[PDB]
Amino acid sequence: DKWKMKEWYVVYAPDFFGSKEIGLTPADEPEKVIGRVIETTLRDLTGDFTKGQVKLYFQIYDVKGQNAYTKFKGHTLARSYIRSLVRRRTTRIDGIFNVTTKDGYKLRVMGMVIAYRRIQTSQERAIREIIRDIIYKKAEELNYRDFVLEAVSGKMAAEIAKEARRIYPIKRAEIRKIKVLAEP
Partner 1 sequence: QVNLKKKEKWGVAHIYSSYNNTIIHITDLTGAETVSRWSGGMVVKADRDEPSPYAAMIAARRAAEEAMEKGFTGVHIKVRAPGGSKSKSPGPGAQAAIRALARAGLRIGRVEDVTPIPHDGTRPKGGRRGRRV
Q: Which is nearer to RNA, 156 or 167 (CB)?
A: 167
At 165, phi and psi to the nearest 5? -60, -20
Between 4 and 43, how does the x/- string for binding to partner 1 read (CB under 8 A)?
Answer: --xxx-xx-----------xxxxx----xx--xxx--x--
**From the list partner 1, RNA, none, partner contacted by residue 18 (C-beta under 5 to 8 A by kind):** none
Site residues for partner 1, window 118-147 (CB under 8 A)?
none
Handedness of CA 161, 167, 169, 173 (dihedral sign): negative
Which partner from the list RNA, partner 1, none does 125 bind, CB cut-off 5 to 8 Å by kind? RNA
Q: Rounded to whole angstroms, what are the CA distances from 165 to 41, 127, 151, 153, 168?
A: 29, 9, 19, 20, 5
Binding site for RNA (CB under 7 A): 83, 86-92, 94-96, 117-120, 122-123, 125-126, 128, 165-169
Distance CA 31, CA 15 (A): 22
